Paper text:
A recently found family of pore-forming toxins, called CDC-like proteins (CDCLs), are wide-spread in gut microbes and are a prevalent means of antibacterial antagonism. Analysis of the CDCLs belonging to the phylum Bacteroidota revealed the presence of sets of two-component CDCLs, one long CDCL (CDCLL) with four domains and one short CDCL (CDCLS) lacking the fourth C-terminal domain, that act as a bicomponent complex via a mechanism only previously observed in the mammalian complement MAC. Unlike CDCs, the CDCLs require proteolytic activation with both components containing a proteolytically cleavable activation loop critical to the regulation of pore formation. Here, we present the crystal structure of a proteolytically activated CDCLL and cryo–electron microscopy (cryo-EM) structures of a prepore-like intermediate and the transmembrane pore.
We determined the crystal structure of act-EaCDCLL to 2.49-Å resolution, revealing the absence of electron density for the D2 β1 strand and its preceeding N-terminal extension, consistent with the MS results above that the peptide dissociates from the protein. Overll, the crystal structures of pro- and act-EaCDCLL superimpose closely, except for differing orientations of domain 4 (D4) with respect to the rest of the domains (33.5° rotation around y axis, shift of 1.4 Å on both x and y axes). We attribute this to altered crystal packing between the two structures and likely flexibility of the domain interface due to very limited interdomain contacts. One notable difference between the pro- and act-EaCDCLL crystal structures is the slight outward movement (1.2 Å) and shortening of the β5 strand (~15 to ~6.5 Å) in the core D3 β sheet in the activated structure. Movement of this strand in CDCs is critical for oligomerization and assembly of the prepore state. The crystal structure of act-EaCDCLL suggests that its activation loop plays a similar role in triggering structural changes that allow for oligomerization, as we observe an initial movement of the β5 strand away from the β4 strand that forms oligomeric interactions in CDCs. Previously, the C11-type protease family was identified as the proteases that activate CDCLs in vivo. This yields the act-EaCDCLL lacking the activation loop and preceding N terminus that also displays movement of the β5 strand away from the CDC-like β4 strand oligomerization interface. Thus, this experiment shows that the D4 of CDCLL is necessary for membrane binding and recruiting CDCLS to form the pore.
Numbering used by the authors: 77 to 198, 203 to 516
Write the structure that this text describes.
Amino acid sequence: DTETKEFESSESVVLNHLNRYVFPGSLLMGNSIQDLNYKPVFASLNPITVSLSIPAINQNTAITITNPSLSATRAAVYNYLKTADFTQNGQLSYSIQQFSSYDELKVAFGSNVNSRNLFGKNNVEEGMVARQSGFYVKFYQTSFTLDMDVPNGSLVKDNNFDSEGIEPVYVSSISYGRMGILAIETNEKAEDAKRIINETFNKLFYKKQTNFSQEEKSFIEGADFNLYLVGGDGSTASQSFKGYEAFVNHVSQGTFSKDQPGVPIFCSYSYLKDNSPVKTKFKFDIKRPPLYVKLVKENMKDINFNDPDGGIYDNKKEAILKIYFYKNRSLVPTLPNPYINFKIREKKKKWQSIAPVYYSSLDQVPFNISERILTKQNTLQNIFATIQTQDNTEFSLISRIIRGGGRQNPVPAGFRAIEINDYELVEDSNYIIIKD
């Protein structure tokens, strides 16, 4: 049981192991950019004119690459920056979004990249956020950008090239600098997590401060972090840590220079055919995670109405039945999923006799048995739900035993009436029962 999700991207995050294919005019297979399995198309390329923008200082220029290539692009940029003003920290930006599956981070990367495998995932719970709440933070510093002009005709010189009948594409714009995508898992509630996360990032990443409150410090020390960073310091896979000082080192601004001016962090593509912009429509399915339910008795009351002078002892046991919902076996609370019908079995054991019957055990009583199933639905407002079994009360009778021999032989023995109700969850295809 999955959830299909569709998004469209005109821009892709450049993974650390692929930045060699990302430069202005880089000609690639039209079917190799969606899964980041870049396949260069070998062709003779014409000169290109690209606009170099340093948005942190609000400056722009125009460099020319006669023979498009990564080396010519590196040489062109440096030989401009070595004579011009540049930036140390670039243009900062971050965006905070909640997520439940690491497959949803595909959208943050703007491609059909195996995001869960990239973040160390890959039951379906393996690719699911474990703690109460999950948020990812896409933060980046843009040092400079390269944006091609529309070619005057074709970017290619000769149409004699092997693209395997696939209409090729070429890298038409690139943004350079440093980018991280930080997954955060907190047992805190989402409203509080989102606020604490925004507050701590405006402090460290933006303002470079570290005067966190104890609330924010406790959030950091108790949160699970998993970062994928694109940069000179970037790994090919994510990195899972759990530390404040580790949090402060990683979320901190990076530095740029004329010798290290930033790596390709995201890029856009055009078609070689008509020089039109490229946009991909993606579709991925999120396997719905399981629902765990536990039946519990609460507000339990054991009442004894005893008449030792008349040899009658009435013991009534009661409780409020309650089902609790969880997203995993670690009892992380969750709001129930819509349209699940929670089923509770009531097995009743009833017996009575006008005259005391001296059974040595309740396993000897000839009980009259009856069973029914209660059904609870539409409970999507709380991480638990009360199970009503009677009229005019949230309490359910667990036990009701009256015994005794009467005024004559006023012993606490014999049996006059027994009613015993046993309760359990009924197996369903939409939830897994947890019974202690």
